[PDB]
Amino acid sequence: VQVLLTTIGAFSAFGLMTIAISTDYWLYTRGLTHSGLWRICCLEGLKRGVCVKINHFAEYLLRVVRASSIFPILSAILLLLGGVCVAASRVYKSKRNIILGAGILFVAAGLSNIIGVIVYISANAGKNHYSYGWSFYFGGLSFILAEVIGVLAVNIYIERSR
Amino acid sequence: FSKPFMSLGISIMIKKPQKSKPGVFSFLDPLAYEIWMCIVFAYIGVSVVLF
Ligand SMILES: Oc1nc2ccc(-c3c(Cl)cccc3OC(F)(F)F)cc2[nH]1
Ligand SMILES: CCCCCCCCCCCC
Ligand SMILES: CCCCCCCCCCCC
Ligand SMILES: CCCCCCCCCC
Ligand SMILES: CCCCCCCCCC
Ligand SMILES: CCCCCCCC
Ligand SMILES: CCCCCCCC
C-alpha cells in the first residue's frame, strides 16, 4: 500500500512544482499588474497587453538569488532525483538501502523550497495592497506533499529492516 | 448696538474619533501574516527532519 503511495506522490509533487514556477501568476499588485517569478506581465498599464522581463539591476548576494531562482528550482531537481530512487524498488530489488537515499532527497527539497520563498518575500518588499495569486499557493503544496512523501519513504525503510 | 446677549469665537471643528473597536485577531499584529505562516511551515519542516 505505502510502496505505491510514494511513486504517485513524486509525480504529483514534481509535476505540480514545475507548474508553480512556470506560470507567472504569483503576486497581484497595483494599474493591476499580476507578478511572477522571472518576469511580470503588466495589465492596465496604458497598454492592452504588455509583458516585459523584470530588471534586478554585501546585499548583492540576495539580488542574484532572486533573479536566478535556483532554490524554487533545486526543489524540483531533488523531487525527480528522489522520484527515480523509489522507482528502483522493482529493478535491482532486495537492496533494502536505496529507499533511504530517497527519504533524504524528499526532505532536502523541502528545505530548499521554504528557502525559495524567504528569498522571494524579503526581495518583494525590498498603502500598496498586494495579494498572493492561485499560482503561488501551488508552491505551498510542493512542500506539504514533500513532507508526507518524506515520512512515507523512510517508514518503509524501517519496516524493511525490521 | 445693545449689550452682547451671547459671546462666541472662532472655534475648531475636527472629525470625532470613533471607538475604533479592535479586530478579533488584533493580537496577531506585532508579527506579519508572512511571519506566522513561515513559522508554521518551519515548524512542520523541523519536525519531519527531527523524525
Ligand atoms: O514554492 C513555495 N513553497 C511554499 C511554501 C509555503 C507557501 C505559503 C502558503 Cl502555502 C500559504 C501562506 C503563505 C505561504 O508562504 C509564506 F512564506 F509562508 F508566506 C508558499 C510556497 N511557495
Ligand atoms: C510561460 C509559457 C508557457 C505557459 C503555460 C501556461 C499553462 C497554464 C496551465 C494552467 C493549469 C491550471
Ligand atoms: C530566462 C530563461 C528562463 C528559463 C526557465 C526554464 C525553467 C526550467 C525548469 C526545469 C525544471 C526541471
Ligand atoms: C512543463 C514540462 C517541462 C517543461 C520544461 C522541459 C525542459 C526544458 C529545459 C530548458
Ligand atoms: C494571520 C493569519 C494566520 C495566523 C497563524 C497563527 C499561527 C500561530 C502558531 C504558529
Ligand atoms: C505514517 C503517517 C505519517 C503522517 C505524517 C504527516 C506529517 C504532516
Ligand atoms: C490560515 C492559517 C490557518 C492555520 C490553522 C492552524 C495551523 C496550525
Swiss-Prot record, chain A:
Belongs to the PMP-22/EMP/MP20 family. CACNG subfamily. Palmitoylated. Probably palmitoylated by ZDHHC3 and ZDHHC7. Interacts with CACNA1C. Identified in a complex with the L-type calcium channel subunits CACNA1C, CACNA2D1 and either CACNB1 or CACNB2. Acts as an auxiliary subunit for AMPA-selective glutamate receptors (AMPARs). Found in a complex with GRIA1, GRIA2, GRIA3, GRIA4, CNIH2, CNIH3, CACNG2, CACNG3, CACNG4, CACNG5 and CACNG7. Interacts with CNIH2. Found in a complex with GRIA1, GRIA2, GRIA3, GRIA4, DLG4 and CNIH2. One of its GO terms (biological process) is regulation of AMPA receptor activity. GO terms for molecular function: calcium channel activity; calcium channel regulator activity. The chain holds residues 19 to 231 of 423 of the full protein. One of its GO terms (cellular component) is postsynaptic density membrane. Regulates the activity of L-type calcium channels that contain CACNA1C as pore-forming subunit. Regulates the trafficking and gating properties of AMPA-selective glutamate receptors (AMPARs). Promotes their targeting to the cell membrane and synapses and modulates their gating properties by slowing their rates of activation, deactivation and desensitization and by mediating their resensitization. Does not show subunit-specific AMPA receptor regulation and regulates all AMPAR subunits. Thought to stabilize the calcium channel in an inactivated (closed) state. The keyword Signal does not apply. The chain crosses the membrane at residues 1-21, 68-88, 98-118, 138-158. It is found in: Cell membrane; Postsynaptic density membrane. This is Voltage-dependent calcium channel gamma-8 subunit. Keywords: Calcium, Calcium channel, Calcium transport, Cell membrane, Ion channel, Ion transport, Lipoprotein, Membrane, Palmitate, Phosphoprotein, Postsynaptic cell membrane, Synapse, Transmembrane, Transmembrane helix, Transport, Voltage-gated channel. Its main location: membrane.
UniProtKB/Swiss-Prot annotation, chain B:
It is found in: Cell membrane; Endoplasmic reticulum membrane; Postsynaptic cell membrane; Postsynaptic density membrane. The postsynaptic actions of L-glutamate are mediated by a variety of receptors that are named according to their selective agonists. This receptor binds AMPA (quisqualate) > L-glutamate > kainate. Palmitoylated. Depalmitoylated by CPT1C and upon L-glutamate stimulation. The lineage of its organism: Eukaryota, Metazoa, Chordata, Craniata, Vertebrata. The M4 transmembrane segment mediates tetramerization and is required for cell surface expression. Expressed in the outer plexiform layer of the retina of the eye (at protein level). Expressed in the forebrain and hippocampus (at protein level). The gene is Gria1. Homotetramer or heterotetramer of pore-forming glutamate receptor subunits. Heteromeric assembly can be the result of both receptor subtype and flip or flop form and according the composition, one partner can be dominant with respect to the fast desensitizing current component, whereas the other can determine the steady-state component. Tetramers may be formed by the dimerization of dimers. Found in a complex with GRIA2, GRIA3, GRIA4, CNIH2, CNIH3, CACNG2, CACNG3, CACNG4, CACNG5, CACNG7 and CACNG8. Interacts with HIP1 and RASGRF2. Interacts with SYNDIG1 and GRIA2. This is Glutamate receptor 1. The chain crosses the membrane at residues 33-51. Ionotropic glutamate receptor that functions as a ligand-gated cation channel, gated by L-glutamate and glutamatergic agonists such as alpha-amino-3-hydroxy-5-methyl-4-isoxazolepropionic acid (AMPA), quisqualic acid, and kainic acid. L-glutamate acts as an excitatory neurotransmitter at many synapses in the central nervous system. Belongs to the glutamate-gated ion channel (TC 1.A.10.1) family. GRIA1 subfamily.
